[PDB]
Design a protein around this ligand. Structure first.
Ligand SMILES: [Mg+2]
Ligand SMILES: [Mg+2]
Ligand SMILES: [Mg+2]
Ligand SMILES: [Mg+2]
Ligand SMILES: [Mg+2]
Ligand SMILES: [Mg+2]
Ligand SMILES: [Mg+2]
Ligand SMILES: [Mg+2]
Ligand SMILES: [Mg+2]
Ligand SMILES: [Mg+2]
Ligand SMILES: [Mg+2]
Ligand SMILES: [Mg+2]
Ligand SMILES: [Mg+2]
Ligand SMILES: [Mg+2]
Ligand SMILES: [Mg+2]
Ligand SMILES: [Mg+2]
Ligand SMILES: [Mg+2]
Ligand SMILES: [Mg+2]
Ligand SMILES: [Mg+2]
Ligand SMILES: [Mg+2]
Ligand SMILES: [Mg+2]
Ligand SMILES: [Mg+2]
Ligand SMILES: [Mg+2]
Ligand SMILES: [Mg+2]
Ligand SMILES: [Mg+2]
Ligand SMILES: [Zn+2]
Lengths: 80, 129, 97, 141, 150
RNA sequence: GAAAUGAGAACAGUGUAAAUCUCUUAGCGAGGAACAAUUGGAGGGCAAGUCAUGGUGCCAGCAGCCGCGGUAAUUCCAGCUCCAAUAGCGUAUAUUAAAGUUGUUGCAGUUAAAAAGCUCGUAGUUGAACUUCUGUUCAGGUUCAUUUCGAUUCGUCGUGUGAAACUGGACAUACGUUUGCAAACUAAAAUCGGCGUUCGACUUAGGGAGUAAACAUUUUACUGUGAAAAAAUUAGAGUGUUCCAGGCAGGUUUUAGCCCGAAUACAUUAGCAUGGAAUAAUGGAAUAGGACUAAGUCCAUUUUAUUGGUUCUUGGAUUUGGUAAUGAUUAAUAGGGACAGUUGGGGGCAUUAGUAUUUAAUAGUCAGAGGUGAAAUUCUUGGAUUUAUUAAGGACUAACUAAUGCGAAAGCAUUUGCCAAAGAUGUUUUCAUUAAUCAAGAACGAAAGUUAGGGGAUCAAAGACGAUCAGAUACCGUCGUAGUCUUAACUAUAAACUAUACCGACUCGGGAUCGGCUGGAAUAAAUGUCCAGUCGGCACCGUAUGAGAAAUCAAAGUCUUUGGGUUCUGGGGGAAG
């Protein structure tokens, strides 16, 4: 027995992006702080490209299917 | 693709009462789907129901009493003069006692029966008993 | 949503009543409480459970509550969850010390 | 859905389909192809004719017997006909060259289970119902 | 799932509920409109521009922020990409196929694949022409394709 | 045993142009072969013989289809007795129903007949969701309910409540505007009376409401009435002696006149009038321009007697300025594109191996090899088979290779390198119905086969031989041509198989898989392993108060509780593809 209108948070957290009721994504946004310049740039959780630090020109993120690996030790807050 | 979601929603629901589901989630929903729903509700077939706001085209959840025996639509929604009624009443309904053949009119949507009251009716929509 | 549920059990169940407001149906059949289906005249696998009423001291009272569970629901291994819920409804499954 | 299309705008389709898929019926295909007119009677129910000769035919499968039959010449049609003479002594009345009235046996096609290629019955001799000649108190020439 | 009696699935993308613009971000519609048209001037697809504004400058959904869909913004600012991504690209690969086919005049799987791709293009033309979003005398044959190559 | 009585036959009367007949009616008119029932059956279907009946003996014949008949026939011939319809009853042929056996409703399509081998694709058919919802109050009925009221009787009305919904109003940013009518009430001003005001009657203004015309993009569709000949069908009245049926007839007791009738409905399809709010299609402002409003200007113009000239009313054209929240629904667990790592025996060019089969060289011996159940043609000391090295050549990709992978299907497995392509996953990217299926019409489609060249190692249709057999131009054995390989043409079929059309939504349990992704743990920091999710892809296990003829089916399911969209196919068998 389960209510379909007041579903558990966990359950919906497991389900597939499009299966959840209100239906929302997983992607998020993050302020990255270069390993040098320090500049704080916003990068999308699913960047589809390599990202440079507009200050110096360092490498911050490498693209993948879904996740974006962050180059070396750079900082990252999840804006939400 | 999809078509007459009223049909999409309807059978999904029948499959419900038939399987003994405790409640149902209808995915693609419209004014029609909802009107039909409150008409079944009003006549006492389905229970309380909630419409969730899918920012695209709402999702509805209908509680299942356990009195729905069958509720479907009718292929092309033929036109039906008031004279064409008994034909369909003896046709679709399991008796001269559960008269529920929903139709579309200019006067909105009425029960198989209400259409005789208002005296107009028009195109068939669906049925439930 | 208790809503619909409370309202179906609401009034009494009475079979085919004629103009002369007479009941005619040879007998009024038992109805499955968790499903609201009809219990046959020969439904082998449908059962009526008898549960007893207790009186605030660990003692038992000469009072029982019945639960009708149709065939199919009992067959899909529902019963245990079905009953455990008809008992929530009639305020009873949760058994406080 | 099933094969047939359920559109309110697709009546034409269903219509032509039925007119077509309908040729699969022999009863239909039969009368529709003026077939009835080509048989020996030319559609007709009965036909007059002259006895060309009384011949006998052998029974088929589990039966063994000498069937009485007359080879007739239909009038306006002018065809050779195989005609079974009914009851017992019957052929004893049919004199060669007399006028005979013939009709079919159970739906024009298969002959009685017993007979081979015979499709007709003989009902009149010189314009005298056979039954009549079969029962003494009736008629004879 | 288009030209596929057998293959079919779900790539992704589901716009979040909250129809307003993210909190953290501050940018009068105009601010974006500049980036958008600037970026566009460099020669970008509204398809690609939007990608930047999400990966680079945290703007999830330009439409939600401006109240304007990219292509529209662009068209209002003269920076309109003549021929739509849709058609453009299909025709691009449609062409790439032809070139490859030449030196491999025997590669049959490719003859087939092109047949499908050329088929699509005729489907877009039918469409884009009907929305008076492309001159009626438009015709992709081989000259329409090589015409864009110059 | 006597009464009864039409057939029958009749003077009269009626009727008729005459005549016939009917009808009324006197004399005459019924008791057993009579004053009269047939026709067609009696195994089953199909109602009726269990006769120990006679004749016939697969003969004569019956039989609609099963089947009867060869010496003891329940189906023949006939007797008897029975059954069925009965002034009727058989038969032949076409046709209706049974025929959900031509199917829109309402079929079938794995194996019974039936999905096309497979994809593309204009006609056709089919198409996601949003746009006054809603509330309050009044009123007219309607119903239903009633610990209820007043009336009547052999079953209704009125009254009250609650309720629902209808309606119609009103009002609430809310389906209209003008007109004329009527008007219903109110706010002022006037007049009139009493004592500026308390009040009253009577005027202007004001919209509902109340009609008619003008408007709400255009149809579908539905309401309703106008139209849809008569006769016929249904059907009211109506004792033609009932009835068919005609439309007449009812009361002389108001009889030189009375009473009453010849009604009504249905009529779909296309046209007309008209009420309309749903579904459905269609449309309005996106280059811009639209809208409303004021003025200016230009063109056109009615009435002013008429012609000019001005003006002006009325249409249209622009410019400007003002007003208005100026004008583009979401973004389909639909579809198309962009992008990102990645995956695959997908494909096309290159390239590249590896053993093996042949065949050749270089050496090495020695009498047998090879083949079968046995042997036999076959090969061999001008050296076989054999062993080592090596080479030429054409095909082939082993073992890993499995209910595992990719490709529309046919089909696809050595390395490496290019060439254009693809799924799935990932997306807070765009585009926003672009789509589903499809006659026409095209792209493919192992083999075998065909044309013209290549190539020719192995196996091998035809063929040549051995053996086996009673027979062997067959199943074994020895050889061998076409092919098998390839380039370029052509051929399109195959148990082209899951014998199960594609798109879509649902519904049981369970682990294991292949590809992608996201969390986590250990090592370790691995293009690895494991735990847990989850999309998408083969497949399996268990099970169904779901399906079936069953085998069986998680779909072959959500179909008598018979209807998501679309294409193709079948209609007893054989002759026949
Ligand atoms: Mg037989
Ligand atoms: Mg899908
Ligand atoms: Mg007389
Ligand atoms: Mg007597
Ligand atoms: Mg008799
Ligand atoms: Mg007989
Ligand atoms: Mg007899
Ligand atoms: Mg006998
Ligand atoms: Mg008969
Ligand atoms: Mg037939
Ligand atoms: Mg108003
Ligand atoms: Mg390759
Ligand atoms: Mg050999
Ligand atoms: Mg070699
Ligand atoms: Mg593999
Ligand atoms: Mg290998
Ligand atoms: Mg070809
Ligand atoms: Mg050759
Ligand atoms: Mg021998
Ligand atoms: Mg050989
Ligand atoms: Mg991980
Ligand atoms: Mg896993
Ligand atoms: Mg079946
Ligand atoms: Mg199974
Ligand atoms: Mg069906
Ligand atoms: Zn830096």
């Amino acid at each position: 027995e389960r209510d379909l209108l007041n579903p558990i948070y966990e359950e919906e957290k497991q389900k597939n992006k499009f299966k959840r009721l209100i239906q929302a994504p997983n992607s998020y946004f993050m302020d990255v702080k270069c390993a040098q310049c320090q500049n704080i740039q916003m990068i999308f959780s699913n960047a589809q490209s390599t990202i440079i630090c507009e200050k110096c020109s360092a490498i911050l993120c490498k693209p993948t299917g879904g996740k974006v690996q962050i180059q070396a030790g750079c900082a990252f807050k999840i804006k939400n | 693709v999809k078509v007459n979601i009223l049909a999409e929603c309807l059978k999904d629901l029948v499959n419900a009462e038939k399987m003994g589901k405790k409640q149902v989630l209808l995915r693609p929903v419209s004014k029609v789907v909802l009107k039909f729903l409150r008409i079944m509700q009003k006549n006492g077939y389905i229970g309380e129901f909630e419409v969730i706001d899918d920012h695209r085209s709402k999702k509805v959840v209908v509680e299942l009493i356990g009195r729905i025996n069958k509720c479907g639509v009718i292929s092309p929604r033929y036109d039906v003069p008031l004279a064409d009624f008994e034909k369909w009443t003896n046709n679709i309904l399991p008796s001269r006692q559960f008269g529920n053949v929903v139709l579309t009119t200019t006067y909105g949507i009425l029960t198989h029966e209400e259409c005789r009251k208002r005296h107009t009716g028009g195109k068939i929509l669906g049925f439930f008993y | 949503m208790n809503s619909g549920r409370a309202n179906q059990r609401s009034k009494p169940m009475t079979g085919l009543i004629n103009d002369k407001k007479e009941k005619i149906d040879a007998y009024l059949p038992r109805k499955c409480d968790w499903s609201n289906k009809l219990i046959f005249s020969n439904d082998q696998s449908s059962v009526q459970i008898a549960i007893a009423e207790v009186g605030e001291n660990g003692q038992a009272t000469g009072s029982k509550t019945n639960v009708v569970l149709c065939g199919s629901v009992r067959s899909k291994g529902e019963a245990h969850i079905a009953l455990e819920n008809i008992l929530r409804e009639r305020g009873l499954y949760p058994i406080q010390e | 859905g099933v094969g047939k299309p359920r559109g309110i705008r697709a009546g034409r389709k269903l219509a032509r389909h039925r007119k077509d898929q309908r040729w699969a019926d022999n009863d239909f295909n039969k009368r529709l192809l003026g077939s009835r007119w080509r048989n020996p009677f030319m559609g007709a129910s009965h036909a007059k004719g002259l006895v060309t000769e009384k011949i006998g035919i052998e029974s088929k499968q589990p039966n063994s017997a000498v069937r009485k039959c007359v080879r007739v010449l239909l009038r306006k049609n002018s065809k050779k006909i195989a005609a079974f003479v009914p009851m017992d002594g019957c052929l004893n009345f049919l004199a060669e060259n007399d006028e005979v009235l013939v009709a079919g046996l159970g739906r024009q096609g298969h002959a009685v289970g017993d007979i081979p290629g015979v499709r007709f019955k003989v009902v009149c001799v010189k314009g005298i119902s056979l039954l009549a000649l079969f029962k003494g108190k009736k008629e004879k020439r | 799932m288009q030209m596929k009696g057998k293959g079919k699935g779900i790539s992704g993308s589901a716009l979040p509920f909250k129809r307003r613009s993210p909190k953290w971000l501050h940018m009068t519609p105009s601010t974006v409109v500049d980036l958008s048209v600037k970026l566009a001037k460099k020669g970008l697809t509204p398809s690609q521009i939007g990608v930047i504004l999400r990966d680079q400058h945290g703007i999830p959904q330009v439409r939600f922020l401006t109240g304007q869909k990219i292509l529209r913004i662009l068209k209002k600012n003269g920076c309109a990409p003549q021929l739509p991504e849709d058609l453009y690209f299909l025709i691009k690969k449609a062409l790439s196929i032809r070139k490859h086919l030449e030196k491999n005049r025997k590669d049959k799987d490719s003859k087939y694949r092109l047949i499908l791709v050329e088929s699509r293009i005729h489907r877009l033309s039918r469409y884009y022409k009907l929305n008076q979003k492309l001159p009626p005398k438009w015709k992709y044959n081989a000259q329409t394709a090589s015409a864009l190559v110059q």
